[PDB]
Symmetry: D2
Amino acid sequence: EAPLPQLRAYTVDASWLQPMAPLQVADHTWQIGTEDLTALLVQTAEGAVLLDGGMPQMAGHLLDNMKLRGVAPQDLRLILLSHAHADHAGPVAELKRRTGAHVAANAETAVLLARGGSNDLHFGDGITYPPASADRIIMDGEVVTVGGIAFTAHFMPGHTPGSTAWTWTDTRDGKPVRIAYADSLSAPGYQLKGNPRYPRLIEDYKRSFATVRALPCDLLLTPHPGASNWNYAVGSKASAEALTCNAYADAAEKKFDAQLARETAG
Amino acid sequence: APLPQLRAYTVDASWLQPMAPLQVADHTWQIGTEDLTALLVQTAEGAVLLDGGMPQMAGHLLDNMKLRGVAPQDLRLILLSHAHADHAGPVAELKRRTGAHVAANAETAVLLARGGSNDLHFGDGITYPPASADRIIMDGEVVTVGGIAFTAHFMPGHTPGSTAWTWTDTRDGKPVRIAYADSLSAPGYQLKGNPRYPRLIEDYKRSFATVRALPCDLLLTPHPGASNWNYAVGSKASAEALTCNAYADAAEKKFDAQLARETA
Amino acid sequence: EAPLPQLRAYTVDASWLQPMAPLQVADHTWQIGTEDLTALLVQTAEGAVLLDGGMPQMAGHLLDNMKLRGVAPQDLRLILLSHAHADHAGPVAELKRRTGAHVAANAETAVLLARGGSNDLHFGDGITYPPASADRIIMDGEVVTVGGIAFTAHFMPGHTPGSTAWTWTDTRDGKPVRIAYADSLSAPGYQLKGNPRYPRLIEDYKRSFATVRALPCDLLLTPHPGASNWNYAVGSKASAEALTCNAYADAAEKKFDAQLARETAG
Amino acid sequence: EAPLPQLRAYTVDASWLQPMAPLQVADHTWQIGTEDLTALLVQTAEGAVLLDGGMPQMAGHLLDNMKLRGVAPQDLRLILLSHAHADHAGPVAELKRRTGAHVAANAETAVLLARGGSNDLHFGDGITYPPASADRIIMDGEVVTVGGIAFTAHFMPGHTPGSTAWTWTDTRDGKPVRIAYADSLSAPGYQLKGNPRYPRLIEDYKRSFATVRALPCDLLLTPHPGASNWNYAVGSKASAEALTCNAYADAAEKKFDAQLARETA
Ligand SMILES: [Zn+2]
Ligand SMILES: [Zn+2]
Ligand SMILES: [Zn+2]
Ligand SMILES: [Zn+2]
Ligand SMILES: [Zn+2]
Ligand SMILES: [Zn+2]
Ligand SMILES: [Zn+2]
Ligand SMILES: [Zn+2]
């Protein structure tokens, strides 16, 4: 037979790889990723926390932005993740090597990260990345504290079994701001009904819609800024049209029901 | 200016050209592609696979196994020359689809568990789905399946974990000593004063001697061209495949010339 | 000052270590563990499945009983677990080395098994065993099939975050029998309320009681046979007074409620 | 039959569990373990390095001694190991959880550490401990640097496949001192000849005696202080009779040869 196909690279839109300067979200919280991939730096008194890292090739850019914020590589103490796909956990292994930071994640995210996103429930081996290990396993509702800032995990399975929202409270213009970093609620091209690899997918999504609606949140952020109507490119107006947690979940549930209609009706 | 896109590990088309099983000995078959070796050894208590080639080769391997009368669940063991993507590529998928166990030395195990990432020389350029080794083996250790004994010979250099495997089969009932020896190339490697591999030169030099000392009637290699095999024709037509001495001699001559150019 | 304490072994009641010959539970299902620890062998024409293995020192006994049942080590295909504590997953690492089995378990069980039971949420490092890796991660309700017998996973977290019940249909004198191997519902010495290492423990147990009551079950077995009133020592009469899923869950929940009340007000 | 045996804990000589206050070895190097188990703390301006940790139950003691040395848990950057048996790597998993330190080890030590010392080539499952992962895999001769102090690895397989000596240069009285922390060369109850799990054991031990003799060394230390004739209980006189690398390897090789002779006979 004809030769087997060549391996396929994980190519993404240029805006996902467009570097940007740090954009201040709150007094201690900064977007340091790219224009279209969120990576949040929280600077505490006893080191910095990174939430998500973006694509594999973004490790150097993250370290450069950390430098501009006054954070040396060894000052990064903790990495948290929304979910362990290649476009959000991509550079985690290299970040651990170059910073010594620990990774805290739930068990589902830990096992997916440790196999580099391979054998994905829905993508197979289509999107892999260098594997990394979690140094601390997190339970639902558990609180991780760095330098006086408490980060609370809220499991919201669906997009991945391990999908998690993280919440914390910063300050902004003299007042506290409850920040919620919620994972994706989409099911892009997923088989929703009767999926042998995820039998309770529909029940998990539906509960996760409700979990997101209930998060303590004055300011919602998402791994893809477009999903919560952020525009990182417009500077200090980046959050002008940012969605509430209610609007984010409702839009997600409406799309999910219609995606379920396209499937169930056939 | 956006960051660079990721690049896929692309190979010569003949590396990906399927072939029907080619008989090497009474129970030993090449079942990979024209230019990547994957050896199937059929025993009384199931099959052994030595290397799998590229990651996209899993289905092809299983199809050739079926043509040989080996159901997926009959694959009992996977052995490896070294844990690079073009030889260990489909190991994770093969484990999931067969239940086979992997046996490898510690160095190969850690690189396989990394999916080839953070390679001493390639960094993250040549990666593949990670897999775990179920049995760690030591230099000279014997693994027996169905009364066929496979002996490991460590030959570090191309990777720290590079291994040769030897076993005895028959050709029409007469015993034949088969040696499956890893690569001895250092493609683009910094040889002298490499911070990530300080004793590289010493290891290659010991490994040339290890290969020459292997018990061997027939030598095969992960890239058939490295031992003058032509998988396009029958195995008896490959009489003039290289001996262990000639294979190591050729590799040592290239290594010495590369070292000289680097020192100059 | 005084020397540090010596390490302490995990010692158990003698009956947990008392070998027994294989006891037929259904036409293809055998108890092959000890008098007071369940280890179920399910034999198909395409190989065997082992559900649990007991304590670490039981490996050789299990292999001896497999040989009496005509299962060569290479024909044990799969190991399933109720939960990853030393008295149920004890010999898994050794069994994997000595057989052709792979382990299928959920992510929580996978991460605890790979720690050898160390850093347990409730037990610390007091009850440990040789680490093993799960080869296949399974999801709630996922079906694993060996030789025509389908095994369905039902997550029932609480005793451990990864606690799982497994169900399958066998036959018993001419008629189908729905077997349920339900995990422990005990909370021995656990802090139930406001546990920073398991914040949703009470909610998980409460849901797990209902999960067990709903399992497809004509014949219940448990990792500790006493918990479902089996008496393996008497042979053919071992099942004569076995509990239903309802009675098992009701008994566990009555004890859980009294423990939580004790924790609420002494 | 009669019941199966109970599990048996790895109990040790109580002197191995006897806490001691930190003993200064050189200007930046301190013994912080117990009277009969070495655990070396190297303090730098960029954090600290721990070489070995002793038994599993020593984690709290190590951290208390670190605090006496001014090293907070988050100040520990790196853990190095001689070998991954329970009485030297015992508390590594707990130390990683409580400090955030990385582990650097060769591939053999990394795989043994990751299975908690289980399935040991010689001891089976008798000496298990909580497993840990290595965060950096190192090669023979590789240099790891923390705060300007360079640590070089020298593989000396035999006692375990992954057995490693670590060398670094410190100062004492304004002069360099080349410190060598060499692993065990013992073979306690080992089948030396024709061992199916370690076929080249004798060749590896013989090469490792030579490797130890060749180490750069003004001051030798060992995981068991008695093996290099240290006495940690006498403070400033602790090293007064410490062996050279030559003497240590010669004594170990003489013992090894007599052991091999009795086995062959
Ligand atoms: Zn995703
Ligand atoms: Zn995404
Ligand atoms: Zn290669
Ligand atoms: Zn190659
Ligand atoms: Zn338990
Ligand atoms: Zn139990
Ligand atoms: Zn030892
Ligand atoms: Zn020792």
